[PDB]
Design a protein around this ligand. Structure first.
Ligand SMILES: O=S(=O)(O)Oc1c[nH]c2ccccc12
Ligand SMILES: [Mg+2]
Ligand SMILES: [Mg+2]
Ligand SMILES: [Mg+2]
Ligand SMILES: [Mg+2]
Length: 459
């Protein structure tokens, strides 16, 4: 029995990033031990502590001493605050790695999230193999690697372009659908994104949470060796599992058991996927007059109370909405067991914000999508899902930023009924089979994990 090498993980801010990073680590146990070296700007939340403490013993956590970000503009985007958090935590990261190295442990790799490339300098100075973990699409990774060239060939704001932007190996995308932090090139968020994208070549490999069956074009382009381009390791789809391992007995799953097969539309924009009052009313009015069964996770709009103290969103729904939907739809406040809903046989569609974790969970369970992108790279994901793979439908937004009921109803109807919705469903089942094929004991993604593991163990 050999001593397990140690691996340090530097995540970018967000539970959405801890989830796929923990799944990645869990699939390399017990060959290594891990430490989540978590930059902080304040007391770690109870959600972070609870999630990280629930992991296997071989994955430890160190919350780095909090840094001060009050000097940043109050309008600073999240990419800027995330980059500032890492840079200012590097001394603490050095002290953490020193505690392990001083005890005799071999530190075999430093895994940094997509906006934590400034920690790569520490790894290079200490003879530690730097790797980047990319929790988004291969399409978005290609955009990152191409951003330098795009920045030097385009002077105007991207949303002003008439022709769609062409990324090597990707479907074209109009500038207005490019990731949020490139929509204002004067903002620090764009400069930070440019900064990180030029540093991906400093890593010995990029680990991307996707697979070739889902993004053939981008993956095959990325795998093609080129000078100045890092090696890429598709290891997706890395997602959490259902609750059938503890002991369809949750309340909302009992309702799904009664409904017909593949007949329910699941609505969930995820935490932070808040709608305006006007936008939520448009969605509620369509569901109220529809004959479509739905399961809707509702959150208080950004513009009385419940048992714990949070505002009760289902009392903010329009007049007698719960009367018009009593037997056909089910409303849930704040949270729902998403993976258990997507795995349920009664679930036929998923209205999602196109966060990549949620998309991968839907693909793995063969549930076609209504793509309602909100922020980050979600609009790029929507284009790839709907115009590329054709496994979902996208409602068009109006000039005032509101998606009207006529569009919500159009895509719902076309997806759950209509012939195009059947083709979409058929295509999504093909991706479902392809997803479980790359994660098998001898799967394409399981092999990529092996390559990474052996590299970490080499020398
Ligand atoms: O958790 S997020 O808010 O999505 O983090 C992110 C902000 N912008 C991003 C662009 C591409 C991928 C991830 C991004
Ligand atoms: Mg705390
Ligand atoms: Mg369907
Ligand atoms: Mg998500
Ligand atoms: Mg964003």
């Amino acid at each position: 029995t050999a001593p397990p090498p140690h691996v340090i993980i530097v995540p970018s801010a967000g539970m959405g990033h801890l989830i796929p990073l923990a799944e990645f680590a869990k699939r390399l146990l017990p060959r290594f031990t891990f430490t989540f070296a978590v930059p902080t700007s304040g007391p770690p939340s109870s959600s972070q502590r609870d999630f990280l403490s629930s992991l296997p013993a071989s994955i430890d956590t160190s919350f780095l001493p909090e840094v001060d970000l009050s000097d940043a503009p109050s309008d600073a985007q999240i990419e800027t605050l995330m980059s500032l958090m890492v840079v200012r935590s590097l001394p603490s990261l050095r002290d953490l790695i020193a505690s392990y190295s001083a005890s005799g442990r071999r530190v075999a790799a430093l895994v940094v999230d997509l906006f934590a490339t400034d920690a790569i300098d520490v790894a290079l100075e200490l003879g530690i193999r730097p790797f980047i973990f990319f929790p988004s699409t291969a399409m978005t990774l290609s955009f990152f690697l191409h951003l330098e060239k795009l920045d030097e060939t385009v002077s105007c704001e991207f949303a002003e372009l008439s022709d769609p932007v062409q990324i090597p190996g990707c479907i074209p995308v109009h500038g207005k659908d490019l990731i949020d932090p490139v929509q204002d090139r004067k903002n620090d968020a764009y400069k930070w994104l440019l900064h990180h994208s030029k540093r991906y070549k400093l890593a010995e490999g990029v680990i991307v949470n996707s697979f070739e069956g889902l993004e053939g074009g981008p993956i095959r382009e990325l795998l093609h060796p080129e000078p100045g381009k890092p090696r890429v390791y598709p290891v997706g789809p890395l997602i959490q599992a259902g609750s059938c391992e503890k002991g369809a007995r949750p309340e909302c799953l009992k309702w799904l058991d009664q409904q017909p097969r593949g007949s329910v539309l699941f609505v969930n924009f995820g935490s932070g996927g808040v709608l305006s009052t006007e936008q939520q009313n448009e969605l509620a009015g369509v569901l109220a007059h529809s004959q479509q069964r739905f399961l809707w996770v509702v959150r208080p709009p950004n513009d009385y109370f419940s048992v714990d103290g949070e505002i009760d969103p289902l009392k903010l729904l329009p007049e007698g909405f719960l009367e018009q939907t009593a037997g056909r739809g089910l409303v849930l406040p704040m949270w729902a067991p998403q993976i258990d809903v997507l795995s349920h046989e009664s679930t036929g569609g998923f209205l999602t914000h196109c966060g990549w974790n949620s998309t991968l969970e839907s693909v793995f369970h063969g549930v076609p999508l209504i793509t309602w992108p909100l922020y980050a790279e979600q609009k790029m994901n929507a284009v790839m899902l709907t115009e590329g793979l054709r496994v979902g439908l996208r409602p068009s937004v109006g000039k005032d930023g509101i998606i009207r009921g006529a569009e919500i109803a159009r895509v719902i109807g076309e997806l759950m009924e209509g012939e195009e919705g059947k083709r979409i469903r058929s295509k999504m089942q093909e991706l479902k089979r392809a997803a479980s094929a790359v994660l098998s004991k001898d799967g394409s993604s399981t092999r990529a994990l092996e390559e990474v593991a052996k590299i970490w163990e080499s020398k």
